[PDB]
């Protein structure tokens, strides 16, 4: 019809809703929501906060069909990916190597703090450890939090084009960050590693409203 989903359907890539015609309303005037098919494929699960024309798959999306619903000028259109999101080749093996290191860190740039733009490009270290995550700038700790049921961590949902390289981390209520990695692979490794370490602490770490 009037819009379509475009993009490589793989972890590491970005998907976007794009107009098929110049007569299609501007995306800024549209209301968009993304969903993932459930694990048993029976229904679609709203990806909370994924309300932009751009959505970058994250690890929970692998093996799932993704969907975008759009309301435009009093009409509606339901779209989906051609198929299931492909995994990132070799990523599983990399994560296994990272597990053996105990605490690993990643160079990151902080782009948001508790919902507010953070313009500084200063490189931070994002530490993903057996029991805690911490974010540091040089010698100073910005945030440190042990895995907890309150914590959230997922691929970013509201900031496309950079999106495939960034994650959202809510350390605790009112304390959150959007953090950008040097590559998509590094971003996804950090998400998977944090989730593995959290799981070993009997914590199920996910994005807001995720079905696990």
From Swiss-Prot:
Expressed in roots, stems, leaves, flowers, siliques and guard cells. It is found in: Cytoplasm, Cytoskeleton. Changing residue 132 to N: Loss of inositol phosphates binding. It comes from the Eukaryota. Disruption phenotype: Defect in stomatal movment and hypersensitivity to drought stress. Plant-specific actin binding protein that bundles and stabilizes microfilaments (MFs). Has no nucleation or capping activity. Regulates MF reorganization during stomatal closure. The binding to F-actin is insensitive to Ca(2+) and pH. Binds weakly to inositol phosphates. The NT5 region (73-100) is required for actin-binding activity. Belongs to the SCAB family. Dimer. Dimerization is required for actin-binding activity. This is Stomatal closure-related actin-binding protein 1. The chain holds residues 279 to 490 of 496 of the full protein.
